[PDB]
Structures are given as C-alpha cells and as structure tokens.
Curated annotation (Swiss-Prot):
Name listed for the protein in its UniProt record: Mitochondrial protein import protein MAS5
Whole sequence portion shown: 1 to 70 of 409
Cysteines engaged in disulfide bonds, as pairs: none
Origin superkingdom: Eukaryota
Subcellular location: Cytoplasm; Cytoplasm, Perinuclear region
J domain span: 9-75
Additional facts recorded: Present with 119000 molecules/cell in log phase SD medium.
Chain's role: Probably involved in mitochondrial protein import. Is also required for efficient translocation of pre-pro-alpha-factor. Involved in heme regulation of HAP1, as a component of the high-molecular-weight (HMC) complex.
Native organism: Saccharomyces cerevisiae (strain ATCC 204508 / S288c)
Amino acid sequence: GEFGSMVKETKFYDILGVPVTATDVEIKKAYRKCALKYHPDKNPSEEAAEKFKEASAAYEILSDPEKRDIYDQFG
C-alpha cells in the first residue's frame, strides 16, 4: 500500500536499467530495450505495460540531461 522514502532516487535509472551516472546513449538504449521488451502491443501483461509507462517517464526526464540533473538533485 504505502511506500517509504519521499525522496525518489535511482528508481527511474533502475527501471530503465541504467546507472545513476548514465549518459544519454545509455538512457536511450535502456528506453529502447525496456519499451521493446515489454511494450503492450506484444506483451499483454499489465506489468509489462507499467514498465513501458515508467520507462517513458524515465525517458522524458532522463533523456534530458537538464531534467536528469533536476531529478537527480531534487529527488
């Protein structure tokens, strides 16, 4: 139900499968693999779809170094 740690660090990196110190390329490929591997159009699982959605959000911030730093520091 409830989750601890208000500060969210590394979760998006972990979800994509990239290090905290990840670069844009690592981020892109992680997105590519996460989306391709668990996309809902081939992977019917809800969780797979969840992974896709999380991957896309991770991508939207992480694929942007500025956003990435913003995420990294603000947590």
